[PDB]
Amino acid sequence: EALSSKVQQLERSIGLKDLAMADLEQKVLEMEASTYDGVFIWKISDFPRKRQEAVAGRIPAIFSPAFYTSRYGYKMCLRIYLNGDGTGRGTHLSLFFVVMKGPNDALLRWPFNQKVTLMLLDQNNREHVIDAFRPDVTSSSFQRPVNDMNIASGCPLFCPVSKMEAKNSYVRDDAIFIKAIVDLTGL
């Protein structure tokens, strides 16, 4: 009993600390993808699988790593519903912009008010899927963040499901690229 206890206790221990390893691995992961010039290219591998998980309702949307407007600027990321959200449910690829809580928010001007351009790159440089917008200053999505993330706001009808998938050049070798450009005017 003596050892049998001091044993399964070091195991529970061995497990708690394993959670602290997976966290640190993701923090490093987020760090490798972060940019600071307002430009971000998000590659989504295992496209087919992730589509299904969306259609099958299992996993409706995916968040992308974070990026900033400058070294100490706004922290942001994207969110995608490979099978639609709201008006584009089941018919369109929905793409959203997310204003996250940044470590420097106290130093930034609010509400967030930079033009944002969203793109679905054509892997044939022929015809990309592009759209843009200016923040709705009265929406809570662009108010100084209180939580980890604000409500995502963007293009629920960004791209017709058929357009991608099918064939074209958007999806190649089971992956797609999403590009976001945050206009830096004023910053």
Partner: peptide, 7 residues
């Protein structure tokens, strides 16, 4: 911009 339907 149009907000997402929660999730």
């Amino acid at each position: 911009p149009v907000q997402e339907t929660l999730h």
